[PDB]
Each structure stands twice: as C-alpha cells, then as structure tokens.
C-alpha cells in the first residue's frame, strides 16, 4: 500500500479532480509494467508517472541512440549511449520522487517471461516491436489472466486521430499485428474463439500505412506517443471498471 | 533556408522516411510559434522539435509549478520555479542542438499581438487557456492570413481517441470554444461565412466534460498538442505541394 503525501496531492491534484479520490489511491497502489521503452513505451511510461501510478517496472535492454530522436521521450543529446530503461527511470524519479521504479535490463523471452511476470502486476503495457518476444509475452499474460494491453506497429503513420483500441484479431493496416497473430497460433496455440476474438486488447490505427519515403518505415512522435497514451488511458479505465465491479 | 547537416539527417532520418526528403527540408526551413507552454503547448513544442522543425518560438510568462506535474512535459522536481518557456527551450536544444529556439517571456494581449506575430511564422499553434488573449490572437492571425491552429478545452476529459480537428464554428461539447466564438464575434466582428465556417481550425474533443478548475491528464492534453502539430504539418505539406 502507498500512503499519499501532501506532496503527492500537490503533484496529482489534477488527477484526483479528473478520475476521483478513489482512483487516486487505486493508481498510487498500482504496479504497472511497461515492456519496451521505445517509440511507444517511453511515452506510456511518462504518462503512467504523470497520472500518479505508484510503482512502475520498465523492461528493455536497449541503449539510447541518436536515431531515436524523432520518436522517443528519452532521446536527448546527453542521453545517447545510456541504457533506455535507466534513463527513463531517472526521469520518472524527477516526475514523482515517491514512485517506486524498477528497471529490468533484459528482453522478454519464452524462457524468462514467467519469472518477470511473477511480480504480480496491476497491468502490463506491451510496447515490444519484435514478434517473437511479443508473442511470448502476450500468450503468457493471456493464459494467466494478467491484464494486458498491446500495441500494434506505430510506424508508417501520420494521423493520431485514427488511433483506437480493438481485439487483436480485428486490427488492420498493421503488419506487426498480422505476424503476431500468426506466431500466436503457430507457437502458442492461441486462436480466435467463436466470436472471432483472441481476447487481447490492442491499440491500432485505421490509417493506411505510409511506406518508406527515403533510403524501414518512418515514424513520428505525434503518432507513436499517442499509441502509448491511448494504451495507458485504456489500462486505467479497465482498472477503474474492475474496482467498481468488485 | 537551412542547410541540413549529417547530424540532422541522423536525428531525423525517421522523419524523412515518413514524410519524404522535400518535407524534411520544408520542416527544417520552417518557423513555428507555440503560444502557451502548458498542458497542451509543452507537448506541441516537444513534437515540433522531434519532427525536425528548424525554428521554434515559445511564448509564455509562467513558471513551472509542482501542480503542473500531471500534464506538462517540463514539470520535473529540478525545474520547479523556473520559467516554463526557458525550461522547454533548453529541452529543445537537447533534442536538436541545431534548432533555432526563441523565448518570448510575455503574455499575448490585443496590444502586443502584432509585434509578436510580425516575425513571419510558417504556422502558429494557439495553446492559450484563457479567452481574452486567445480571441485576440486568433482574430489577428485570421485577418492577416497567418496559418493557425487553435486548441479548445482539454481539461475534464479522459478519452484521447475523441480528439479531432474541425472549423471553430462546428465544435461541440466544448465550453471554451463556445466562449471563444462569442468573444470573437462581439469584440472583433468575426462571424460565420455563407458556408457556416469561421475559417479557423480548432482541435477539440467530442467527449462530454467530466466535472470534479477541471482535472486533466497527460494522455489527453498532450494528444491535443500532437494533433495540432500533425494538422499544421499536413497543411504545410499540402501548400508546398500546390506550389
Ligand atoms: N523482448 C523485448 N523485451 C523488452 N523490450 C523490447 C523487446 N524487444 C524490443 N524491445 C524494445 O522495444 C522498443 C521499440 O521501439 P521502436 O524502435 O520505437 O519500435 C526498443 O526500445 C526495444 O529495445
Ligand atoms: N495570453 C497568454 N499568452 C501566452 N501564454 C499564455 C497566455 N495565457 C495563458 N498562457 C499559458 O497557457 C498555459 C496553459 O496551460 P494549462 O494550465 O495546462 O491550461 C499556461 O502555461 C499559461 O501561462
Ligand atoms: K494502421
Ligand atoms: K469536449
Ligand atoms: Na480519434
């Protein structure tokens, strides 16, 4: 449990006024895991910190690169070469000194996913950009009823107003989600039920993909960050709904 | 014109692969003004910097407050008490050391708007949260054909997926936009044309307001800023393509 300080109420008074006092405590007591701290995940982590989430785990083994500058909140001249997750953790500690931040300097694999998820998270935000670990994470959380929201590919898109949430089985214009569905089926026996759903919530966009315009898909902050923000809003909404139901 | 360095191409290669080389050059050559560096404007400024916009002016006179923490990108423990616009300017120089960043430590008034807009901006992003200077800024840019995107109320809302852009005359569920229309009409003679349009593009949300001095969330206020920036870039690219 987290005791909400007077400082915490100064930082997050606007949160309490928007979501309610019960939600402020719910968020303070929550532990959310963000897997992948890149074009989508770095903004998700920022949003969690700024909405009074009391414990955040960040999982990534990558370093900050100069080419991250177009789409990642931690990508600053002075951060290049440092571990992404550690850089983001330090920022979170500046946002909320009372937030409990854990860094896992690793990638999720079929072999370690149970270990890393054994912490008992309130929610998992899957912002992984490669299919093999993404499938392992999703299959595990789905099997174990761990609340999860995943994100499709956020590159090759310029319009943030077309971003929305649907079941993973129903995404369009998203090659990553399409590969992911194939891998879930072939490697984990995850297939859609009678209603044509996989039972996995996925942030995606109706926008037709914009192919590389210069000599891999490009990306923009305005879209990749909004993927991350929509994932966070979705998660908090589901957490509040569950709490109201119990 | 701006000569794009090797360093610039490394930072914004992803931008070039999304929008094209001509647009990369267009952005590098652009000068965009953000008025109000708060819950909406700070994220707009961030987005401009990370999309290779070559010159950015920031206008705000307020300081970073601890109560900004829920919704403003510059609100960090070590920044509290410093001028928002200078903090954001310093951050932009960390994003792109070659960006030409100007800080105007002031608020826009009917009396100073001409001076501050005479610079010749490629686009103005209006992220002011109070009606009187907001109307004055919009009236001036509209009269002078200065490209402008304005933002409605972003507080009291939890759903980023209902944010959109339309003409200011057609917004709904937005008390700030409604007040703004009234003040524009009464004080500046700005009224709807034959097609029912004011000729002002407005970012707003269809979401019904949530009453508790509204609360706010980063996920929504930042997305207002991002949508404003994407809208401006879309219009800039279209104009360049016409010509
Ligand atoms: N298996 C994994 N576990 C954790 N993070 C990952 C994994 N695979 C990829 N990521 C991260 O996801 C991010 C993708 O960002 P982007 O380049 O914007 O697609 C990068 O920071 C990667 O290091
Ligand atoms: N007349 C004005 N000119 C420039 N900036 C302003 C003006 N009025 C308000 N602002 C700023 O707009 C921001 C609004 O942010 P928020 O508190 O999230 O609504 C604050 O940083 C204000 O200081
Ligand atoms: K899409
Ligand atoms: K609204
Ligand atoms: Na939308």
Author numbering:
A (entry chain B): 2 to 216, 237 to 267
B (entry chain A): 2 to 213, 237 to 267
Sentences from the paper on this structure:
The enzyme responsible for t6A cyclization in E. coli was identified by comparative genomic approaches and analysis of LC/MS data sets of genomic deletion strains (ribonucleotide analysis) as CsdL, subsequently renamed to TcdA, for tRNA threonylcarbamoyladenosine dehydratase A. TcdA is an ubiquitin-activating E1-like protein with detectable homology to the adenylyltransferases MoeB and ThiF. To further the understanding of ct6A biology we have determined the high-resolution crystal structures of CsdL/TcdA in complex with AMP and ATP, an E1-like activating enzyme from Escherichia coli, which catalyzes the ATP-dependent dehydration of t6A to form ct6A.
To shed light onto the structural basis for the tRNA binding and ct6A synthetic properties of TcdA-ATP, we determined the crystal structure of E. coli TcdA loaded with ATP to 1.77 Å resolution (R/Rfree values of 0.139/0.176) and AMP to 1.89 Å resolution (R/Rfree values of 0.141/0.183). The structure of TcdA-AMP was solved by MR using the fully refined model of the TcdA-ATP complex. In the TcdA-ATP and TcdA-AMP complexes, the region between β7 and the C-terminal α8 spanning residues 214–236 is fully disordered in electron density maps. The first 310 helix (H310a) contains three residues that are conserved in the MoeB/E1 superfamily, including a strictly conserved Asn69 that interacts with bound ATP/AMP via water-mediated hydrogen bonds. In particular, the P loop and the residues that contact ATP/AMP are nearly strictly conserved across all structural homologs. A second metal binding site specific for Na+ is found at the dimer interface in an octahedral coordination. The Na+ cation is axially liganded by the carbonyl oxygens of two symmetric Thr162 residues that lie in a short 310 helix segment (H310c) from opposite monomers, with four water molecules occupying the equatorial positions.
